[PDB]
Amino acid sequence: PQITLWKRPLVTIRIGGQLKEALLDTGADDTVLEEMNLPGKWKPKMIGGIGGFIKVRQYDQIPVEICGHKAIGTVLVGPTPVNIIGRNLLTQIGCTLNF
Amino acid sequence: PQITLWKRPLVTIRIGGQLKEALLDTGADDTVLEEMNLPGKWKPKMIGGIGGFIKVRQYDQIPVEICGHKAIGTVLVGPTPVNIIGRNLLTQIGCTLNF
């Protein structure tokens, strides 16, 4: 699809068998979801942005379906204000910015 | 142009008579610039992101050229780690996400 930006670019994703709403975020290197359980091993990591650093759990090689497109990659879980799909998965679904 | 997301989508902008590098950020409602001594009236604001809130100065009706496309609107100035172009100006330049 082509998504304009008058509204927040929120989309439905599927992950770990569950549906969630997430923001397509070209300003994020990584994908960060609100507190949730995911299967498998995770590693502690820290990530930063506006407002500073937070602690997250890093899950590797997680399948995520985004607006019907398949990605498999790193998902960080932690106290993010909103579920964020970052460039690590945006690239996998072929997302570009155009103007 | 078309901008892929393999790397951070940094582009050149012009604002208040300076050229700067800024991140095209579909996740950001607002445009937030690194500290700069911009003339004009401003109002205080608090904006949130990944790690919490920061205090910024809100300036209205500021002309901002993004990769040669003219825009004009609200710009927030404060201790962001990165100059970010948010949706308020991305819409003005006809920027879309496409996959």
Binding site: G27, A28, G48, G49 | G27, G49, P81
Partner: peptide, 4 residues
């Protein structure tokens, strides 16, 4: 930095 990472998540804006």
């Amino acid at each position: 930095r990472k998540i804006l």
